[PDB]
């Protein structure tokens, strides 16, 4: 399982507008 | 600068000018069995290689809508090309997309992961959407495409998307278009929509 920070997520939403959370992604090995 | 990712095929790489480019969306069109998925798997491995081997020392993101992503196919490609397959698998971030809304959601999260991986030893250099294929539905797709364009540009990544054809192809705006078809004796033919490459699908993935 792969994690992502709330900060990077916030940055991502701001980018498309015009500490750890669930990413929805995992490695091809299942992590 | 513009980076390039080898497809594993000398012939294919030449048609594309050296491999799939970053800061751009490359679209592949073809009928069922044409090799779009196999090429997406090959690239997910090729991108991980140093630039001397035709990669970008990066990682790949794979959004799958056809439930055709196979980690064991990745293993075969890696093992056959002489790479540690456990490591190749670790460097592919995979998400299965159940509907259009979900796909869009995964794009926001994939973007968040790109931000975080920026300036590390192995940032995400490739994003695969297999497969791309009501008033709202057309609108959603357009929005999805715009987001992809912004991702390619802001994060210096290569975006690879696949389209299933049921000749006169309706491609999306501002993309590099490649048309795949079956040739003679397992060979596949590639040609740019806007002269021709011939390649095979082998235990190494895509190659001449
Ligand atoms: N391990 C493998 N080695 C060689 N060829 C394979 C392997 N797995 C699948 N193929 C072949 O690759 C071709 C392309 O399949 P695919 O990429 O799924 O096409 P599409 O996505 O266009 O439907 C098929 O003809 C299939 O038989
Ligand atoms: Mg497919």
Distance CA B44, CA B54 (A): 12
Q: Is B61 on the interface with A (CB under 8 A)?
A: yes
Distance CA B58, CA B49 (A): 7
Give the strand order in the sheet containing B205-207.
A26-27, B92-96, B59-64, B124-130, B158-164, B24-30, B176-182, B188-192, B196-202, B205-207
* Integer angstrom CA distances of residue B50 from B54, B83, B145, B151, B205: 7, 12, 29, 22, 18
Nearest to B178 by CA among B19, B61, B58: B19
Nearest to B61 by CA among B3, B107, B105, B7: B107
Terminal Cα distance for chain B, rounded: 28
Q: Which DSSP letter does residue A12 get?
A: H
Of all residues in chain B, the one with the smallest CA distance to A1 is B93
Which of B96, B113, B148 to substitute to test the interface with A, most A CBs within 10 Å? B113
Distance CA B127, CA B91 (A): 12
Record the resolution, in angstroms.
2.0
* B163, two tokens: 């389209």
Of all residues in chain B, the one with the smallest CA distance to A16 is B147
Distance CA B75, CA B143 (A): 34
* B98, two tokens: 């159940």
- Tokens 């075969």, located at residue: B76
Q: Is B96 on the interface with A (CB under 8 A)?
A: no
B77 membership: H or E segment, kind and range: helix B71-80
Sketch the domain layout of chain B as residue ranges. 1-208
Tell me whether residue A30 is exposed, middle or buried, using C-beta atoms within 10 angstroms of its C-beta: 0 to 12, 13 to 18, 19 or more: exposed
Task: Give the closest ligand to the alpha carbon of residue B133.
Answer: 2
**Obtained via which technique?**
X-ray
Distance CA B184, CA B198 (A): 10
Sketch the domain layout of chain A as residue ranges. 1-31
- CB of residue B30 inside a 6 A radius of ligand 1: yes
Grouping H, G, I as helix, E, B as strand and the rest as coil, residue B73 is helix
With CB atoms and an 8 Å threshold, state whether A12 touches B150. no
- Helix B71-80 vs helix B36-46: crossing angle, to nearest 10: 60
Distance CA A22, CA A8 (A): 12
Distance CA B88, CA B16 (A): 24
Distance CA B47, CA B43 (A): 6
φ/ψ of B74, rounded to 5, equals -65, -40
- Tokens 């040609």, located at residue: B191
User: Which residues on chain A are in Cβ contact (under 8 Å) with B122?
Assistant: none
- CB of residue B38 inside a 6 A radius of ligand 1: yes
- Tokens 């790949």, located at residue: B60
* A24, two tokens: 């929805």
Do B204 and B54 meet the contact criterion of CB atoms below 8 Å apart?
no
Fold category of B1-208 in CATH: Rossmann fold (3.40.50)
**Closest ligand 1 atom to B66 CA:** 21
Measure A18 CA to nearest chain B CA, in Å.
10
**β-pairing verdict for B24-30 and B124-130:** unpaired
């Amino acid at each position: 399982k792969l994690n992502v920070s709330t900060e990077a997520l916030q940055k991502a939403v701001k980018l498309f507008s015009d500490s750890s959370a669930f990413s929805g992604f995992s490695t091809a090995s299942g992590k | 600068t513009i980076g390039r990712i080898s497809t594993g095929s000398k012939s294919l790489d030449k048609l594309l000018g050296g491999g799939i480019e970053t800061q751009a969306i490359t679209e592949v069109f073809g009928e069922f069995g044409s090799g779009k998925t196999q090429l997406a798997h090959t690239l997910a491995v090729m991108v991980q290689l140093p630039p001397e081997e035709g990669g970008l020392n990066g990682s790949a993101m794979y959004i799958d809508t056809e439930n055709t992503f196979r980690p064991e196919r990745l293993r075969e490609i890696a093992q056959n090309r002489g790479l540690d397959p456990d490591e190749v698998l670790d460097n592919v971030a995979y998400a299965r997309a159940f509907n259009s809304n979900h796909q869009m959601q995964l794009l926001y999260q994939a973007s968040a992961m790109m931000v975080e991986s920026l300036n590390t030893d192995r940032p995400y250099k490739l994003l695969i959407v297999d497969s791309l294929t009501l008033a709202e539905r057309q609108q959603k797709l357009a929005r999805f495409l715009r987001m992809l364009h912004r991702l390619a540009n802001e994060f210096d990544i290569a975006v690879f998307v696949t389209n299933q054809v049921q000749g006169h192809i309706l491609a999306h705006s501002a993309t590099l278009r490649v048309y795949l078809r079956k040739g003679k004796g397992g060979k596949r033919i590639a040609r740019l929509i806007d002269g021709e490459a011939v390649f095979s699908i082998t235990e190494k993935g895509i190659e001449d």
